Amino acid sequence: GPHSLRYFVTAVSRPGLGEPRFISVGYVDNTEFVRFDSDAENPRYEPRARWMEQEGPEYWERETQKAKGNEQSFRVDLRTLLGYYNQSKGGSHTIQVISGCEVGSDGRLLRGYQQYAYDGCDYIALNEDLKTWTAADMAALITKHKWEQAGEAERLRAYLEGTCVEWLRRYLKNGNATLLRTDSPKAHVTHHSRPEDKVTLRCWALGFYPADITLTWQLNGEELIQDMELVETRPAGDGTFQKWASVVVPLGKEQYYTCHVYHQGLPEPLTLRWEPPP
């Protein structure tokens, strides 16, 4: 299937608290593999996956220097944006970028990214044509014109279609065996009291990876897509994820309900019911 190399980059200004904090994080197929943080004792791009450890010293030097250059650009961007939005020099502000490429099974580029946000809102983004820009407001129109006047889309296009794709291929070769990790959910139902003649049945899915999962409750063939409570999928902290979905049912009718768990690691979706303790 498809793959992606994306860098998620942030600077946060701290007037009277020092220089802006700059963090740059790389992802292969949505998995963090590199990180740079300006607040580290000695700021360097670091491996965040073991398969990256085989990249030699010159790789780390070059990319550390690139990050330091991007840090400078972001520092400048922040001062510039302060003027564009006529904001006071004393406030804290954030700039964020998502940059990179998505490639299909056949190695062709599906999508190239270059999106900017100022203070958590869209600023400017490269269009799917890889030639033009969408500016979110008046201020971003200044940048749109500047980058048109610099041919920025062409320099960016060469990176996206060339450099990004080539490096993604290399990273995938080194990381395939690790990135392919799949952990199927292990599921169970818990039983909890509700006022009067009702009980809560909670279907748990634990230990799974990737995080993508669906949990459903059925009463006699019908999916209860109205009264089911569910939590956002959440990290266990150990590389695996957790989710639950619960339903309120009549006391004594617990065996009339079934939970189903859908995951990519499951050949057949799981079916389970409340079982009272052994």
Binding site: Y7, V9, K66, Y116, I124, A150, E152, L156, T163
Partner: peptide, 8 residues
């Protein structure tokens, strides 16, 4: 590897 960003 990342892109060398321009300034806004």
């Amino acid at each position: 590897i990342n892109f060398d960003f321009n300034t806004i």
